[PDB]
C-alpha cells in the first residue's frame with residue numbers, strides 16, 4: 597500500500613544509520629539508483645548545493661518543494677548552529693514523509709515544514725513566521741512557479757542584497773522564463789552550474805542568482 601515516497605522512507609528506516617544524515621542521503625541515493633527513480637536533487641547536483649551552503653553560510657534558508665526531505669536533509673546537515681531551514685510543501689503526504697526523514701536523520705530541530713502552496717505561504721512569511729529577510733532560497737517545486745514565486749519573494753520584501761537563489765532543473769525539464777528573468781535583470785548576478793539530472797546521465801544544471809536589490 598506504500599506510495600513511492602513511503603517505499604523510500606521504508607528503505608531508509610531499515611538501512612540507514614539512525615541520527616546519521618549522510619547515511620540517510622546515501623540510502624536514498626542507493627534506492628533511486630538500484631530500485632526505483634525519484635526526483636530528489638541527487639548526489640551530483642547535491643555537491644553543488646553543498647558548496648553553495650558552505651560558501652554563503654545562510655542563517656535562514658527557504659526551500660520550495662520538500663518531497664521526501666532529501667534536499668532538506670542535505671542542507672540542514674550543513675547549517676551552522678542557530679541557523680534554520682523552512683521548507684514549503686503543497687502535498688501533505690510528502691510533508692509527512694519529509695518530517696519522518698528529518699526525524700530519522702536527527703535534523704528535526706533545524707527544520708520547519710510549512711504546509712501549502714508556495715504562492716499562498718510566501719505572503720505569510722513575515723507575519724506568521726517572524727521572517728525578516730531570507731539568506732537563501734532553493735527553488736525545486738514546479739517549473740511554472742519559478743518566475744512568479746521569485747517576483748512574489750521580491751514583492752513581499754523577503755530578498756535582500758546578497759540573497760542567493762538556487763534553482764534546480766533550469767535545463768531539464770527547463771525553466772526558460774525564470775532564466776530569461778534572472779539573466780536579463782540588473783537585480784541579479786548569475787552563475788550557471790552544469791551537472792547531471794539526478795541518477796541519470798542526462799545533462800541538467802542549477803542556476804545561482806544573487807539578488808542585488810534595487
Ligand SMILES: Nc1ncnc2c1ncn2[C@@H]1O[C@H](CSCC[C@H](N)C(=O)O)[C@@H](O)[C@H]1O
Pocket residue numbers: 635636637638660661662663664665666667668684685686687690712713714715736737738741
Ligand atoms: N506550488 C508549490 N508549492 C509547494 N510545493 C509544491 C508546489 N508545486 C509542487 N510542489 C511540491 O514540490 C515537490 C517537488 S520535488 C522536490 C524535491 C526536493 N527538493 C529534493 O531534492 O529532495 C513535490 O513534492 C511537490 O508536491
Ligand SMILES: O=c1[nH]cnc2c(O)cc(-c3ccc(F)cc3)c(Cl)c12
Pocket residue numbers: 635636637661736737738739764765768769793794
Ligand atoms: O517536477 C519536478 N519538481 C522538482 N524537481 C524535479 C526534478 O528534479 C526532475 C524532474 C524530472 C526531470 C526529467 C524527467 F524525465 C522526469 C522528471 C521533475 Cl518533473 C521535477
Ligand SMILES: [Mg+2]
Pocket residue numbers: 635636637736764765
Ligand atoms: Mg528538481
